[PDB]
């Protein structure tokens with residue numbers, strides 16, 4: 001659909017906002033249900049497009065389920081092992097169905113992702129892991145055909161840190177009744193949340209450094225789980241408070257999943273005060289330039305990069321923002337330039353020369369998480385900012401415009417087919 005936002009800038013964000021459950025924790029945890037025949041219940045699941053597409057895939061695979069009040073109730077009566085190309089094109093993370101399907105049936109046919117606007121994003125590490133696990137892997141008709149003659153222990157080291165690669169491996173190993181080892185894994189909070197679910201199902205998982213020791217099972221149980229809060233949504237509103245010189249109180253977020261973000265926010269001039277579990281955020285000092293490099297968790301998230309770039313576009317001084325994760329992820333830099341920013345891009349590094357003010361205009365969303373930076377800039381740009389193709393934002397945030405409106409943003413959504 002062609003829905004868009006109209007943001008009339010000039011209001012400080014003030015008040016409370018409740019942070020939703022983590023989209024990227026809910027996805028792998030939903031795919032984990034494929035590993036059991038028993039009913040599972042998942043709560044604090046956000047109602048956003050990626051979740052809806054994952055539920056559609058599970059239904060296509062044979063599951064019976066309901067999604068009500070941010071809760072997924074599922075009977076994993078999986079009777080197929082084909083994840084079609086259409087679903088993969090809609091959400092490449094559907095590749096997470098591979099590990100579970102293989103663990104359940106010993107075979108799987110999953111569409112191979114195409115390129116993405118964020119980058120080529122190949123899955124060589126996922127395929128390399130399954131080959132090392134002893135599976136026969138072949139690409140034909142644009143699908144990855146995987147066949148496993150027998151489950152055996154695996155000892156695999158990732159060549160690079162990959163979030164879903166780690167998850168896909170854990171999902172499969174949880175079904176193998178032997179002691180396996182993964183090295184150089186991702187430590188993201190969402191990966192840790194998936195791990196608790198796999199343990200609830202009956203697998204044993206020990207994390208030490210970036211190594212994971214797994215002991216799986218062929219009789220995994222059903223589970224009940226409440227997913228962790230979404231730290232990217234939390235960081236986004238924090239940035240919004242500081243950028244608009246407002247004062248907000250985030251409810252249901254976790255300070256322990258935000259260290260690198262809070263650190264950078266304070267260096268720029270913001271302040272974050274914990275009140276019980278709530279986080280009060282406001283601007284303490286005038287905005288100033290800061291250098292930022294994205295890194296795997298616990299470092300600064302690539303999913304927060306664009307948002308900080310918008311904040312820094314109006315800070316005093318020149319900021320250097322380097323991507324070590326998705327080096328190509330800078331489409332938003334030029335959209336911000338359309339608002340009067342002065343951002344340059346050279347290879348994997350962007351330089352932001354802060355300007356006194358931004359000027360509202362039409363910009364296009366293209367990244368389910370990074371495009372939140374455009375909405376943020378629209379909050380302070382002079383006049384009116386029109387954010388096109390919010391379908392992307394609908395994939396990545398739950399009720400974004402409603403939450404901003406509740407905080408005082410003069411924002412509205414125009415529904416357009």
Ligand SMILES: CC(=O)N[C@H]1[C@@H](OP(=O)(O)OP(=O)(O)OC[C@H]2O[C@@H](n3ccc(=O)[nH]c3=O)[C@H](O)[C@@H]2O)O[C@H](CO)[C@@H](O)[C@@H]1O[C@H](C)C(=O)O
Pocket residue numbers: 024027093119120121122123124125126160161162163164165186190301302303325326327368369396
């Ligand atoms: C569903 C989900 O959790 N998706 C998230 C996860 O994608 P993922 O794909 O697993 O991230 P990677 O594998 O850690 O990618 C990190 C780098 O590693 C390269 N690489 C990855 C795997 C591989 O086999 N080969 C390989 O080369 C790759 O190209 C990238 O440059 O991690 C990213 C980084 O934190 C997030 O931005 C992304 O959110 C997104 C936006 C969203 O919400 O939709």
